[PDB]
Design a protein around this ligand. Structure first.
Ligand SMILES: *[C@@H]1O[C@H](CO)[C@@H](O[C@@H]2O[C@H](CO)[C@@H](O[C@@H]3O[C@H](CO[C@H]4O[C@H](CO)[C@@H](O)[C@H](O)[C@@H]4O[C@H]4O[C@H](CO)[C@@H](O)[C@H](O)[C@@H]4O)[C@@H](O)[C@H](O[C@H]4O[C@H](CO)[C@@H](O)[C@H](O)[C@@H]4O[C@H]4O[C@H](CO)[C@@H](O)[C@H](O)[C@@H]4O)[C@@H]3O)[C@H](O)[C@H]2NC(C)=O)[C@H](O)[C@H]1NC(C)=O
Ligand SMILES: *[C@@H]1O[C@H](CO)[C@@H](O[C@@H]2O[C@H](CO)[C@@H](O[C@@H]3O[C@H](CO[C@H]4O[C@H](CO)[C@@H](O)[C@H](O)[C@@H]4O[C@H]4O[C@H](CO)[C@@H](O)[C@H](O)[C@@H]4O)[C@@H](O)[C@H](O[C@H]4O[C@H](CO)[C@@H](O)[C@H](O)[C@@H]4O[C@H]4O[C@H](CO)[C@@H](O)[C@H](O)[C@@H]4O)[C@@H]3O)[C@H](O)[C@H]2NC(C)=O)[C@H](O)[C@H]1NC(C)=O
Ligand SMILES: *[C@@H]1O[C@H](CO)[C@@H](O[C@@H]2O[C@H](CO)[C@@H](O[C@@H]3O[C@H](CO[C@H]4O[C@H](CO)[C@@H](O)[C@H](O)[C@@H]4O)[C@@H](O)[C@H](O[C@H]4O[C@H](CO)[C@@H](O)[C@H](O)[C@@H]4O)[C@@H]3O)[C@H](O)[C@H]2NC(C)=O)[C@H](O)[C@H]1NC(C)=O
Ligand SMILES: *[C@@H]1O[C@H](CO)[C@@H](O[C@@H]2O[C@H](CO)[C@@H](O[C@@H]3O[C@H](CO)[C@@H](O)[C@H](O[C@H]4O[C@H](CO)[C@@H](O)[C@H](O)[C@@H]4O)[C@@H]3O)[C@H](O)[C@H]2NC(C)=O)[C@H](O)[C@H]1NC(C)=O
Ligand SMILES: *[C@@H]1O[C@H](CO)[C@@H](O[C@@H]2O[C@H](CO)[C@@H](O[C@@H]3O[C@H](CO)[C@@H](O)[C@H](O[C@H]4O[C@H](CO)[C@@H](O)[C@H](O)[C@@H]4O)[C@@H]3O)[C@H](O)[C@H]2NC(C)=O)[C@H](O)[C@H]1NC(C)=O
Ligand SMILES: CC(=O)N[C@@H]1[C@@H](O)[C@H](O[C@@H]2O[C@H](CO[C@]3(C(=O)O)C[C@H](O)[C@@H](NC(C)=O)[C@H]([C@H](O)[C@H](O)CO)O3)[C@H](O)[C@H](O)[C@H]2O)[C@@H](CO)O[C@H]1O
Ligand SMILES: *[C@@H]1O[C@H](CO)[C@@H](O[C@@H]2O[C@H](CO)[C@@H](O[C@@H]3O[C@H](CO)[C@@H](O)[C@H](O)[C@@H]3O)[C@H](O)[C@H]2NC(C)=O)[C@H](O)[C@H]1NC(C)=O
Ligand SMILES: Nc1nc(=O)c2nc(CNc3ccc(C(=O)N[C@@H](CCC(=O)O)C(=O)O)cc3)cnc2[nH]1
Ligand SMILES: *[C@@H]1O[C@H](CO)[C@@H](O[C@@H]2O[C@H](CO)[C@@H](O)[C@H](O)[C@H]2NC(C)=O)[C@H](O)[C@H]1NC(C)=O
Ligand SMILES: *[C@@H]1O[C@H](CO)[C@@H](O[C@@H]2O[C@H](CO)[C@@H](O)[C@H](O)[C@H]2NC(C)=O)[C@H](O)[C@H]1NC(C)=O
Ligand SMILES: *[C@@H]1O[C@H](CO)[C@@H](O[C@@H]2O[C@H](CO)[C@@H](O)[C@H](O)[C@H]2NC(C)=O)[C@H](O)[C@H]1NC(C)=O
Ligand SMILES: *[C@@H]1O[C@H](CO)[C@@H](O)[C@H](O)[C@H]1NC(C)=O
Ligand SMILES: *[C@@H]1O[C@H](CO)[C@@H](O)[C@H](O)[C@H]1NC(C)=O
Ligand SMILES: *[C@@H]1O[C@H](CO)[C@@H](O)[C@H](O)[C@H]1NC(C)=O
Ligand SMILES: *[C@@H]1O[C@H](CO)[C@@H](O)[C@H](O)[C@H]1NC(C)=O
Ligand SMILES: *[C@@H]1O[C@H](CO)[C@@H](O)[C@H](O)[C@H]1NC(C)=O
Ligand SMILES: *[C@@H]1O[C@H](CO)[C@@H](O)[C@H](O)[C@H]1NC(C)=O
Ligand SMILES: *[C@@H]1O[C@H](CO)[C@@H](O)[C@H](O)[C@H]1NC(C)=O
Lengths: 404, 455, 137, 97, 48, 49, 48
């Protein structure tokens, strides 16, 4: 920016390595020297994908008979299957579908180790009682979602023509659940744990007969003694049954085999892209790398082989082969710059020139912009390493000189 | 529900002789972590040729566990009689995080026939039977070991060729020597080798059928079987429970000779298992054909950090229990089985509580009466009750109203009703429910801007 | 390489410029340290080392074999990972990591680079060899 | 007598190995810290982006940034300490020659 | 509507749920021992 | 732990962790600076003796 | 001693291993410094 504010000169900081240098010092004039700059990135040349492909995950149970009350929720656990939430959601009039610790787009598109679906009858009038922040009876004694795993909650109404789902007489819930200790002075509220059933489930009937019913069980000494007690409550039934569906997903306890179905191209196979840098998504595991055919190590049944820094370093494919996985590797870059001549050369340290006058292979890497001179110096200003030096022609190209 | 075959039609159970003295043996086989005993392999992955620490459910180094041994029943020559068992059905344990079992460790050694201490025989592997569930209590005569509601039963059958897992309600039968009948001692399973273990056709329901003599199986939700190839190889079995169900682990399908356990099954058991017991088993052998059966050992699991040595082939052959002792802590901190000589500081030996002391204000109830008398104020004229030096009970107040929406901020729900405070301030007012959202922190409407705002 | 991250990284100021400049200076410091140190070991005048140097005093241990015998032994007995100054990039692809926690191959993965020293081995050997020959005189 | 001296009892020899080990440790900080999540759901930026929307995605990426910026600052601080020490040591070597 | 605001340390935290006390939770009876404590809302571990 | 549930409890514990990790890193950095200084000083003491 | 904290601490990597190793080395440094210093103050021959 000039004094009058106009821009008269600029550097595109991603144009080349010399430009990166000027930008890092925020100046158009930097001192002579050899500087490290951002590496020349390897970029993906394609992608490989492997997903479980097969059986649909089965939501049929859900659709047949009278759903349980909130404290007796039923659980469907899906593993090793193709899921489709639209397939289930489309059967209900959804009133409220929200997600936590997972985006909306993600719930319907990511692969999981497992998907757990908890379904139950639930009045919509008590919607708020399922909130994480709630201190009412549902969240304290009946049903609580995980705080650790990503979850979604769907509240939906059963359509008049979905005749396979029947209604209970009333909606019901536990409004009290507690233990009376052996002294019969102290009463301890028994709160429901996330993803678990309340201890009072065994004393509370599948339908509370009437609001205010009190239940009691004498506990054995192995259960700590005393009494387990509970109180039920009811909500009048609606014209259409309202149901809640909790969804909990886990991301890495097993192969993430619960995936949306995918139509596979045969150009996304690993064997067809060996040696290339590709993006990968293997049963929910993703990143970038290069696959190589190699000797199997690790336990085959476990599929993914990890190193001591927890990187994925190998994989057993469903095509029967074991592949080594290497990172797409970046190519080191150092800029050799001479301020007086306004010239430069690029050193790719540690890199053979097969990956890059043409390029010159030197003891410290591959260098472009230098010409081999078979000349010696003592007075080296731009040392390259080992006993090599860049020597400006003064302008011409820099010479590669040896230090005497 | 699942059809699990017909009910037993017998009017009586076989009499069970419980003589614990005969089963009070000392044959210790504690977990040797350095030999990787009891280890469940990290589940979602493998490693090769590395040493790393890992957090997971493991048995403790040095844990002796609980030894259980099955025996031959009583006989007279060629006619087997009464069953002979240990007091196992009444010995109910807390499940906690699950357990691992050492099975057949003594196989091929010369052992004892438990029922006849002077009789020796080659020891053969036998599989453990388990009963697991959410609630326990007693039977009709007061003996313990009854499980209520759905109970998970892991019952090996077919003379050791299958594992049968089922989740069902066990209804005690009322016949002679049965749990709801007369002269009951303990239920037990059995098989009769003479008719059940023919060289060709093994009776795959022999143990199920004996189980059924003591209990009627009702509302079974599942019954699964797993096949076991016969051998005399030491193997490990394990059980854990998560939101996904009960996980059954075994070394025999992946690392048969090595011993690492891998998951082979998940059962749709979602209620929490709190209790378990060993179902005693007695073999109705003839007197002339009694065998010594290997003891099995049950070890409890807990969330421990182990140093795990993964071989090139991925199996864990060696490990360190990083909390066992100070030397073990050292190896774990360097993530190595070999550390240099020296003097190192390690975690301190913690003092642990030996009890607790509590002092609370005890006295007057905090008084919510004002709240209940007369016309409540409008939202801009809210009234405030400040409670100090009193015993509070929110249920006492909440129970008087039909609560439509109760939420908390910067305090948990459990905490609002259970913690001590310097003060509790209660602001009450008339308020239409139709304007519920106007009380939200994020609201820019008239209530939050001009009438009432929370801290 | 993730653009969202880079976008957030920018709100921390010129963080990476500071990292690079601090290390650049730190690295120049060794080239200057080495240059100064060797300038001082350097002899003005020296006698040639010939086999037999030392007379009755057995100095074969120190004579160049070129590094001396003790010097090669010193290096052979110290476990040093090979940084691959000429073609390490490729060694780590065609062979892969030598072992668990291979910090040389980690360079191309993690985003760091080990730079070569100011002088090659034969030059350093030349300095100490000329030094040996200067001692008596 | 010294030909066989580059062993466990030679203090000068261990100092040579330790200088080598110190270089390795310096590099291990960078190699080992990228696997940390620093409270994030994943050490992978790609996993964060794939699972979360911007208002939360941002917070998770930011945890990884803070952890990595911290790691690099620690690394640099040590390279400056180690290079200062080596430079002083180099002057000692100069005096001894 | 009922708003509830709670404060945790301006005074002795004397607004507590009622508790039935055992006499083995007294301080005098456990002197010299490491115990957990909860004294008018103040808690931790220590030796009295 | 006594006051908050996991999604918020975590954030609060994490603040304490970050502060304590920072403190320990600062401590260690200074013990390394101070031990390096003392070691140089010890060599000065050696020369003076 | 709080398990929740320890669980979260683990997500910061082997933090404590680094603290312990750094101090262990720093502490060895003084034992070596002292040993070397005294080895040099030590006299070969001395009068009473
Ligand atoms: C996850 O789960 C969800 C839910 O299960 C899946 O989403 C469904 O996907 C299917 C496709 O696989 C999709 O079917 C499509 O429906 C449209 C809509 O047509 C309806 O209305 C017209 C009005 O004119 C009617 O004529 C027609 O019959 C349909 O009527 C329906 O409703 C009436 C009552 O009102 C009933 O009486 C009817 O029986 C019927 O139920 C169709 O137009 C569409 O047809 C095209 O594809 C089929 C493929 O078989 C092809 O045969 C047709 O000729 C036509 O294809 C031509 O046109 C397309 C462009 O549209 C072009 O690409 C082709 O090349 C051809 O030129 C088809 O039947 C269904 O609606 C989706 N449902 C929901 C809720 O989203 C989702 O796919 C799953 N995900 C995964 C990964 O599996
Ligand atoms: C915080 O504030 C809350 C709210 O104020 C406190 O919670 C209350 O705690 C009391 C106990 O202190 C609890 O009372 C218990 O109620 C049950 C329910 O019985 C009702 O239904 C049965 C149906 O068969 C009726 O028969 C019975 O009369 C009750 O009917 C009520 O409603 C009808 C209208 O429908 C009215 O007409 C009635 O008058 C009545 O209002 C009782 O079963 C329970 O009784 C047991 O305890 C009493 C103690 O005095 C004892 O005398 C009884 O014999 C019986 O004890 C035996 O059984 C227990 C096991 O249950 C065993 O442990 C004993 O050893 C004996 O073997 C008692 O009356 C009330 O319901 C709670 N309310 C709420 C909303 O939670 C809370 O305690 C406070 N916290 C603190 C720390 O103080
Ligand atoms: C009671 O007695 C029985 C036998 O009477 C013991 O059973 C033997 O146990 C040993 C050790 O577990 C088994 O030996 C292992 O055999 C494996 C495969 O053997 C099969 O395949 C090979 C060819 O690959 C055949 O030659 C062999 O005959 C079998 O057909 C080997 O792979 C194992 O080697 C692996 O482990 C060893 C270390 O143990 C490594 O050194 C090897 O490199 C390799 O990793 C091993 O050799 C033996 O086969 C079992 N017998 C039977 C019949 O199966 C019971 O263990 C014993 N019970 C108790 C409690 O002691
Ligand atoms: C989980 O398992 C438990 C335990 O099996 C189970 O509780 C049992 O429920 C049944 C009924 O649901 C109870 O059986 C009878 O129920 C009728 C109901 O009208 C009572 O009238 C019967 O009373 C007789 O016994 C009394 C004993 O004092 C006599 O006083 C009375 O005069 C009658 O003779 C009897 O209660 C059964 O007793 C309980 N069992 C226990 C141990 O409480 C529970 O329902 C299961 N839970 C679920 C959710 O399935
Ligand atoms: C030994 O143990 C096994 C358990 O592993 C047990 O297996 C069960 O056998 C029964 C049959 O004896 C199976 O029940 C059948 O399953 C088929 C499945 O298609 C049904 O079609 C059959 O229905 C017909 O018969 C019914 C009999 O009442 C009629 O009511 C019905 O209307 C049909 O006519 C029937 O349900 C059962 O599923 C398996 N169970 C398992 C878990 O595999 C076996 O019976 C035991 N054997 C003995 C001798 O006890
Ligand atoms: C306990 C005892 O000594 N009883 C006397 C019998 O020993 C004796 O008859 C002889 O019994 C022999 C077998 O004795 C045992 C055995 O070790 O096998 C003794 C065991 O303690 C007993 N075990 C248990 C748990 O009670 C066991 C068992 O009763 C049987 O196996 C029955 O199935 O028997 C052996 O069989 C001899 O051949 C037999 O003569 C009788 C006199 O006939 O007197 C008993 O007091
Ligand atoms: C000056 O000193 C050097 C050593 O510093 C002497 O050379 C050494 O001579 C011995 C002979 O006893 C050689 O031993 C041989 O070692 C090999 C090792 O495999 C063994 O196979 C032979 O059987 C024998 O034991 C030793 O290696 C050799 N060392 C070197 C570096 O050459 C040298 O002779 C001395 N010169 C004079 C004039 O004394
Ligand atoms: N029916 C039957 N089943 C068996 O399992 C059985 N086992 C034995 C032998 N059992 C054992 C088990 C361990 C040791 C043993 O050598 N233990 C060591 C101590 C191990 C330790 O505590 O670290 C010892 O020296 O006693 C001996 C015999 C004998 N008869 C049997 N009979
Ligand atoms: C498993 O890891 C060990 C390291 O613990 C490897 O052994 C090293 O192999 C290299 C090969 O050049 C030698 O230079 C090292 O000196 C060996 N170290 C030890 C401690 O022996 C072993 O080869 C690895 N196995 C496989 C199949 O990769
Ligand atoms: C176990 O299954 C039975 C049948 O599927 C359930 O239903 C009861 O069955 C008995 C059979 O004699 C009938 O007399 C009852 O009237 C039936 N009750 C109902 C409500 O239909 C039984 O409820 C199931 N038990 C459990 C605990 O699920
Ligand atoms: C577990 O083992 C049983 C018994 O070997 C298998 O059942 C046999 O399957 C064959 C298949 O041709 C039949 O011919 C036999 O008649 C079956 N036997 C019986 C007793 O029914 C069973 O399939 C095995 N299970 C698995 C999962 O492999
Ligand atoms: C149910 O199906 C009948 C069939 O004619 C249709 O007329 C009716 O509108 C459908 N109802 C709903 C709610 O879709
Ligand atoms: C690869 O995909 C093409 C797409 O049409 C198909 O024609 C070809 O047969 C496929 N190759 C194999 C091996 O399936
Ligand atoms: C991988 O290598 C093995 C042997 O080294 C070979 O037989 C197999 O076919 C190769 N697989 C591929 C995909 O090239
Ligand atoms: C430069 O050319 C000379 C030819 O004499 C050759 O010996 C030397 O190795 C070359 N240098 C490089 C870096 O190629
Ligand atoms: C069963 O026997 C064992 C071992 O002798 C004893 O410890 C246990 O308490 C007994 N249990 C019962 C319920 O009798
Ligand atoms: C447990 O025992 C008591 C007396 O011993 C008896 O009254 C009670 O009914 C028993 N419980 C069961 C479930 O039979
Ligand atoms: C301590 O508690 C017991 C419990 O029954 C009681 O009997 C005893 O009198 C109490 N002691 C005092 C000093 O109150």
């Amino acid at each position: 920016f000039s004094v009058d504010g106009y821009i008269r000169r600029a550097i595109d900081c991603g144009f080349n390595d010399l430009s990166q240098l000027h930008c890092s010092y925020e100046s158009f004039d930097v001192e002579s020297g050899v500087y490290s700059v951002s590496s020349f990135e390897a970029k993906p040349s394609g992608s490989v994908v492997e997903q479980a492909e097969g059986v649909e995950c089965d939501f049929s149970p859900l659709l047949s008979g009278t759903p349980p009350q909130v404290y007796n929720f039923k659980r469907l656990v899906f593993t090793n299957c193709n899921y489709n939430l639209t397939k289930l959601l489309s059967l209900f009039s959804v009133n409220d579908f929200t997600c936590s610790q997972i985006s909306p787009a993600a719930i319907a598109s990511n692969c999981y180790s497992s998907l757990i679906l908890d379904y139950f009858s639930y009045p919509l009038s008590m919607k708020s009682d399922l909130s994480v922040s709630s201190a009412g009876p549902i969240s304290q004694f009946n049903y609580k979602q995980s705080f650790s795993n990503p979850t979604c909650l769907i509240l939906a109404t059963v359509p008049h023509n979905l005749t396979t789902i029947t209604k209970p007489l009333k909606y019901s819930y536990i409004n009290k659940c507690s233990r009376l200790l052996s002294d019969d002075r102290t009463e301890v509220p028994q709160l429901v744990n996330a993803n678990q059933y309340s201890p009072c489930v065994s004393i509370v009937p599948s339908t509370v007969w009437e609001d205010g019913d009190y239940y009691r069980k004498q506990l054995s000494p192995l259960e700590g003694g005393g009494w387990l007690v509970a109180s039920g409550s009811t909500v009048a039934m609606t014209e259409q049954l309202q149901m809640g569906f909790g969804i909990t997903v886990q991301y890495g306890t097993d192969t993430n085999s619960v995936c949306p179905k995918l139509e596979f191209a045969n150009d996304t196979k690993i064997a067809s892209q060996l040696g290339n840098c590709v993006e990968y998504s293997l049963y929910g595991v993703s990143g970038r790398g290069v696959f190589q055919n190699c000797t199997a190590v690790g336990v085959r049944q476990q599929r993914f082989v990890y190193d001591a820094y927890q990187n994925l370093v190998g994989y057993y494919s469903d095509d029967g082969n074991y592949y080594c996985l290497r990172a797409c590797v970046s190519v080191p870059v150092s800029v050799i710059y001479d301020k007086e001549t306004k010239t430069h050369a690029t050193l790719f340290g540690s890199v053979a020139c097969e990956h890059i006058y043409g390029p010159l292979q030197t003891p410290v890497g591959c260098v472009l912009g230098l010409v081999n001179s078979s000349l010696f110096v003592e007075d080296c200003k731009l040392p390259l390493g080992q006993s090599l030096c860049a020597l400006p022609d003064t302008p011409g190209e820099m010479r590669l000189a040896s230090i005497a | 529900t699942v059809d699990v075959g017909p009910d037993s039609v017998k009017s009586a159970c076989i009499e069970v002789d419980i003589q614990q003295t005969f089963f009070d043996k000392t044959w210790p086989r504690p977990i040797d972590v350095s030999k990787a005993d009891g280890i469940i392999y990290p589940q979602g992955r493998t490693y090769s040729n590395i040493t790393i620490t890992y957090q997971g459910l493991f048995p403790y180094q040095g844990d002796h566990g609980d030894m259980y041994v099955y025996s031959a029943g009583h006989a007279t020559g060629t006619t087997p009689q009464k069953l002979f068992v240990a007091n196992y059905s009444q010995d109910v344990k807390q499940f906690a995080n699950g357990f691992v079992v050492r099975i057949g460790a003594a196989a091929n050694s010369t052992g004892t026939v438990i029922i006849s201490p002077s009789t020796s025989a080659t020891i053969r592997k036998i599989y453990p039977a388990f009963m697991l569930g959410s609630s326990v209590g007693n039977f009709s005569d007061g003996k313990m070991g009854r499980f209520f509601n759905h109970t998970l039963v892991l019952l090996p059958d077919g003379c050791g060729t299958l594992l049968r897992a089922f989740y069902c309600i066990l209804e005690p039968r009322s016949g002679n020597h049965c749990p709801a009948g007369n002269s009951y001692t303990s239920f037990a399973t059995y098989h009769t080798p003479a008719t059940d273990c023919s060289d060709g056709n093994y009776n795959r329901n022999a143990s199920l059928n004996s189980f059924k003599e003591y209990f009627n199986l009702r509302n079974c939700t599942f019954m699964y079987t797993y096949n076991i190839t016969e051998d005399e190889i030491l193997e490990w079995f394990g059980i854990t429970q998560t939101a996904q169900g009960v996980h059954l682990f075994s070394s025999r399908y992946v690392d048969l000779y090595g011993g690492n356990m891998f998951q082979f099954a998940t059962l749709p058991v979602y209620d929490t298992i709190k209790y378990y017991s060993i179902i005693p088993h007695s073999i109705r052998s003839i007197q002339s054909d009694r065998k010594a059966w290997a003891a099995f050992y049950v070890y409890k699991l807990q969330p421990l950090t182990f140093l795990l040595d993964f071989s090139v082939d991925g199996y864990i052959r060696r490990a360190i229990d990083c909390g066992f002792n100070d030397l073990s802590q050292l190896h774990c901190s360097y993530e190595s089985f070999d550390v240099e000589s020296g003097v190192y500081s390690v975690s301190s030996f913690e003092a642990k509580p030996s009890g607790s002391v509590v002092e609370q204000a005890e006295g007057v109830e905090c008084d919510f009466s004002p709240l209940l008398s007369g016309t409540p104020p409008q939202v801009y004229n809210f009234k405030r009750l400040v409670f100090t030096n009193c015993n509070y009970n929110l249920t006492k107040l909440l129970s008087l109203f039909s609560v439509n929406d109760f939420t908390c901020s910067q305090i948990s729900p459990a905490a609002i009703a259970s913690n001590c405070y310097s003060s509790l301030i209660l602001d009450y007012f008339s308020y239409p429910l139709s304007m519920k959202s106007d009380l939200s922190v994020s609201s820019a409407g008239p209530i939050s801007q001009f009438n009432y705002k929370q801290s | 390489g993730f653009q969202k991250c880079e976008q957030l990284l920018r709100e921390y100021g010129q963080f990476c410029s500071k990292i690079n400049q601090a290390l650049h200076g730190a690295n120049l410091r060794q080239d200057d340290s080495v240059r100064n140190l060797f300038a001082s070991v350097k002899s003005s005048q020296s006698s040639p080392i010939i086999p037999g140097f030392g007379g009755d005093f057995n100095l074969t241990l120190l004579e160049p074999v070129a590094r001396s015998a003790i010097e090669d032994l010193l290096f052979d007995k110290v476990t040093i990972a090979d940084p691959g100054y000429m073609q390490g990039y490729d060694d780590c692809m065609q062979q892969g990591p030598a072992s668990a926690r291979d910090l040389i191959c980690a360079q191309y993965v993690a985003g760091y680079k080990v730079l070569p020293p100011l002088m090659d081995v034969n030059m350093e050997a030349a300095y100490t060899s000329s030094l040996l020959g200067s001692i008596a005189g | 007598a010294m030909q066989t001296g580059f062993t466990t009892t030679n203090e000068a020899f261990q100092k040579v190995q330790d200088a080598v080990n110190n270089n390795a440790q310096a590099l291990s900080k960078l190699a080992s810290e990228l696997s940390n999540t620093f409270g994030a759901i994943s050490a992978s930026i790609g996993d964060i982006i794939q699972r979360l929307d911007p208002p939360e995605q941002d917070a998770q990426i930011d945890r990884l940034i803070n952890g990595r910026l911290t790691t690099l600052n620690a690394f640099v601080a040590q390279q400056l300490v180690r290079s200062e020490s080596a430079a002083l040591s180099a002057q000692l070597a100069k005096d001894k020659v």
